[PDB]
From Swiss-Prot, chains A, B:
Name of this chain's protein: S-adenosylmethionine decarboxylase proenzyme
Native organism taxonomy: Bacteria, Thermotogati, Thermotogota, Thermotogae, Thermotogales
Signal peptide (UniProt feature, chain positions): none
Enzyme Commission (EC) number: 4.1.1.50
Pathway per the UniProt entry: Amine and polyamine biosynthesis; S-adenosylmethioninamine biosynthesis; S-adenosylmethioninamine from S-adenosyl-L-methionine: step 1/1
Organism field: Thermotoga maritima (strain ATCC 43589 / DSM 3109 / JCM 10099 / NBRC 100826 / MSB8)
Site for Cleavage (non-hydrolytic), residues: 61-62
Gene that produces this protein: speH
Amino acid sequence: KSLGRHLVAEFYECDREVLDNVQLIEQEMKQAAYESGATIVTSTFHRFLPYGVSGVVVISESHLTIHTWPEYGYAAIDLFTCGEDVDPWKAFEHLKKALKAKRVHVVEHERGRYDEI
Amino acid sequence: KSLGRHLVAEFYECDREVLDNVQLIEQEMKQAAYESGATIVTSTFHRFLPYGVSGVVVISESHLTIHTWPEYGYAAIDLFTCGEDVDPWKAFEHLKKALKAKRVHVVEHERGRYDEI
């Protein structure tokens, strides 16, 4: 129906320790990419001071991103995947478990609708 | 009223030459970052055969991403910024002009609403 599927997610009340662990966040982000069925092209993760992590996993034609605010137990996550063989919800599931979010909000966008392009 | 502002944009009927130019796309994406007043953390762009360019400009606690489909004159753009002093719409404007998009669709999300966290 479209070139890609995009999940815009708000993760609340997460494990603040994990949110401020740049090493662990990277590990869980690439593992989520594996779970969705995507092939990782590259990934870059950075630590924000005093608290916070930011990272992006570039996959085939799309990406997986995360930005954390440990001080609020909040994380802004984006799971944009292309192709039927890659399911972004598998990535969502792994991250939800990894970050121990207690409340989540997700909006699913169709990127590049066939009837539009 | 939120940690960040995120524009999910669909760019249609773009200059197909520009969409397939990894060198020009990187240049224009960095210029859009400057225009928004954001601080660049890292930058990574890749060109996939036969056509297609994917790139991400990680900025302070957020990102600017783009994935093009030259064969459709389509581009999937995301402009996620944090701070009252960084305006995602300035990035949108520079990109809309650079890619010569003749039709656009944009959804603006408030990431990390204050009343949610």
